[PDB]
Amino acid sequence: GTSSGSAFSADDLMSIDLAEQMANDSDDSIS
Amino acid sequence: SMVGQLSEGAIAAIMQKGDTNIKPILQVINIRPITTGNSPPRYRLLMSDGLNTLSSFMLATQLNPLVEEEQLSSNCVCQIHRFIVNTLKDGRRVVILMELEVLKSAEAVGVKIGNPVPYN
C-alpha cells in the first residue's frame, strides 16, 4: 500500500526461475 | 458494471486459501521489467480482480513475447488458466502466471476497472 511493490533481488529471481522450471519439468510426465 | 467482467475475490482466494484451481479473469494495471545481465527479463505485474490489486504477480518466461509484442499491456483483461504460488526466503509470496489468454486488449478496455484496493 505504500509503493509499487518490494523489489526482487538476484536470489529471489533464482527462486522464481526454479519454481517455473519445476512446473515445466512436471509437464514432461504428461506431455 | 465493468467490475462484472472481473473475478472479484480471486486474489483473496489465492492469498488466503492457496486456491490454485480457479481460472480467474483479471485486469493488468501495470507491468514492470526486472532485468539481469545473463537472464531474460522477468515481468512483474500489478493485477486487479476488481476488488483488490496485488503487485506480486510474475509472468512465466515463456510468455514474455506477449509483453514484448504489446498484446499483454496495461488495462487489458486476461483469464488466468494456470498459475503457481511460490514463497521466497523472506516470507513474501509471488504468483507465477504460467498460462493465460488475453480476452480484451488494453485499447478495447480503456481504463482501470472499478476502484480496487491493494491487498498488501
**Beta carbons of A16 and B55 less than 8 Å apart:** no
Query: How is residue B16 written as a grid cell?
Result: 488466503
Which residue is associated with the grid cell 509503493? A3
Resolution to one decimal, Å? 1.4
Give the count of domains, chain B. 1
A10 burial via Cβ count (<10 Å: 0-12, 13-18, 19+): exposed
Which residue is associated with the grid cell 489468454? B101
> The CATH number of the domain where B101 resides is what?
2.40.50.140
| B119 → chain A, closest CA residue | A1
DSSP structure string for B9-49: THHHIIIII---S---EEEEEEEEEE--SSSPPEEEEEEE-
Domain membership of residue B69 as a residue range: 2-118
Nearest-angstrom CA–CA distance, B23 and B78 = 10
| B85 → chain A, closest CA residue | A19
Q: Which method was used?
A: X-ray
Contact yes or no for B15/B97 (Cβ under 8 A): no
The CA–CA distances, whole Å, from A4 to A28, B24, B56, B79, B103 equal 36, 23, 10, 23, 25
Instruction: Give the burial string for B33-60 (b: 16+ CB within 10 Å, else e).
Output: ebeeeeeeebbbbbbbbbbbbbbbbbbb
**Beta carbons of A13 and B98 less than 8 Å apart:** no
The CA–CA distances, whole Å, from B19 to A22, B16, B80, B82 equal 19, 8, 13, 11
Nearest-angstrom CA–CA distance, A30 and A26 = 8
**Beta carbons of B55 and A11 less than 8 Å apart:** no
Cβ-Cβ pairs closer than 8 A, A with B, add up to: 47
| Min Cα–Cα distance to chain B from A25, Å | 13
Query: How is residue B43 written as a grid cell?
Result: 515481468
